[PDB]
Target: Cysteine synthase A
Amino acid sequence: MFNSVLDTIGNTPLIRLSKASELTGCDIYGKAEFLNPGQSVKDRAALYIIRDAEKRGLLRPGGVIVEGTAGNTGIGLTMVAKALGYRTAIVIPETQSQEKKDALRLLGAELIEVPAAPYRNPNNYVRLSGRLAEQLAKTEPNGAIWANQFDNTVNRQAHIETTAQEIWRDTNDQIDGFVAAVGSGGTLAGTAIGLKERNHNIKIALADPHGAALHAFYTTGELKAEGDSITEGIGQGRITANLEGFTPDFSYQIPDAEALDILFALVEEEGLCLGGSSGINIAGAIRLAKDLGPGHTIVTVLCDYGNRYQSKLFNPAFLRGKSLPVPRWLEEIDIPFEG
Model:
């Protein structure tokens, strides 16, 4: 029933979050986007972006897709590209986890590592990937397109047409609230459009880590960032094109300790080891449940696995340096060798 791995993208299950549901008197669920074949939520935008470039005649067999990505979008793009007969040129900051870079080279991406840089600096990997697409388009006979996830609204469109419909159908029209953190804004803005189209009374919440500017913008009008977060995949300092015209009904600023407490307990109590953005998202789902009151159904997103972030998110020495909680179980049996 599946002609290729592309047919396994999406249609992900809702997993009940036991301790969060018990604490709030609500039914809280996390959408298991980590069960996508590329192992993250980004498979959805990756498919839609490449299909859009095809339908517009911008990609011909053997063409190249260029993207500035911290990793997940690169993995999703290269998987879809190889299945459909295209190539990828991936600009990634050199600071990202080795596990992510290896996955990209194993899948066949052409990998270009650059130093980390704030968006203000033109050598920021996103702005730089735009100029790389412009450069390669001059010499690629089969096309060279800029995926441009942050500002290509086909990203948002993927979540309008798939994520929101799956959530609407899987909760049997009973969902009361949806909450997610923002990177490009595709997940939150797109799911919100699709959910509110189905029921304008659904409440939408932003979950924002320290060091992002979006909570301040929506609540005070100022794009002001304070502190920093060790979570990765999220944290946005400008209104991207995917965020254009979006306003959340609730907005929460989640400190790292709150998200990590949830993540560490989820490993031990519920057998789930998830990335930093999932801790921010579940923390926001609990906040939303408290504002709505008991008896409601809330859905958030479990964006990727915790594996790829062990050296920081689950590292005692690194966490202690930032005064963050430490996984208790990472803090002497006689082996019964014979002879």
